[PDB]
Design a binder for this molecule. Structure first.
Ligand SMILES: O=C(O)CNC(=O)C(=O)O
Ligand SMILES: [Mn+2]
Lengths: 19, 215
């Protein structure tokens, strides 16, 4: 649907955390 | 104590309401240093247009009119942003096992964002539409003596399923948490003064891996 037309980009990187 | 704050205040507020506001998170001195680092980053001209997951136009300011830069926290002159990120990570990891079914095992870089007044804003949207793994949105605000009646810029959250809403002023040293999925549609109403904030999204382990196999 059109939801992702409005959603903020998350960037190309995920930084591991917690465990 | 960060842990005590998290379990006593943040975990209940999130599981009951899906939104949690913590004022005076770091104190005036540290928050001021963060504001200085953000404004120095802005002064270098590096900020670029906020991006959308599915972008169709090079210029999409009518969807979101903010300018941003991504920060890992290890960069030169960004030590205090890094301290802010370390504080948030310590808090969140201490919530694990208590934020519903979520087991957070990652985050984005920090998104430093500036709405440069002039009626810029962000239309009502959901952060995580399609299970991209983002489960908690964290935003730290940096704007002192913010008067919404003059400057706009209110974050209005419309929690799903009821005519209710939560109006969050982008108040200096305020830390905001909310579920990133469709439970919390939200908008930044047009701002008429410079409006700074730092966002980090936190990822749920299982949804993150599923999103990985799906993209
Ligand atoms: O800055 C705010 O108050 C809210 N920001 C967002 O909803 C976003 O950037 O995705
Ligand atoms: Mn958002």
């Amino acid at each position: 649907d059109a939801c992702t037309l409005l959603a903020p980009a998350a960037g190309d990187t995920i930084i591991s955390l917690c465990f | 104590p960060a842990l005590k704050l998290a379990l006593e205040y943040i975990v209940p507020a999130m599981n009951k309401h899906g939104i949690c506001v913590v004022d005076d998170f770091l104190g005036k001195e540290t928050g001021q240093q963060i504001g200085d680092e953000v404004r120095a980053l802005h002064d270098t001209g590096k900020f670029t247009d906020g991006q959308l997951v599915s972008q169709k136009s090079d210029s999409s300011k009518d969807i979101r009119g903010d300018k941003i830069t991504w920060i890992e926290g290890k960069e030169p002159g960004c030590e205090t942003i890094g301290l802010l990120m370390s504080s948030m990570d310590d808090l969140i990891c201490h919530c694990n096992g208590k934020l519903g079914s979520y087991k957070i095992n990652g985050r984005t870089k920090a998104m430093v964002a500036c709405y440069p007044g002039n009626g810029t804003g962000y239309v009502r949207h959901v952060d995580n539409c399609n299970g991209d793994g983002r489960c908690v949105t964290c935003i730290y605000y940096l704007n002192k003596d913010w008067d919404a009646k003059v400057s706009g810029g209110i974050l209005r959250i419309f929690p799903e399923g009821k005519a209710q809403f939560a109006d969050i002023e982008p108040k200096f040293d305020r830390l905001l948490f909310f579920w990133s999925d469709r439970r919390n549609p939200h908008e930044v109403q047009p701002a008429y003064a410079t409006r700074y904030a730092i966002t980090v999204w936190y990822f749920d382990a299982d949804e993150r891996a599923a999103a990985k196999v799906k993209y």
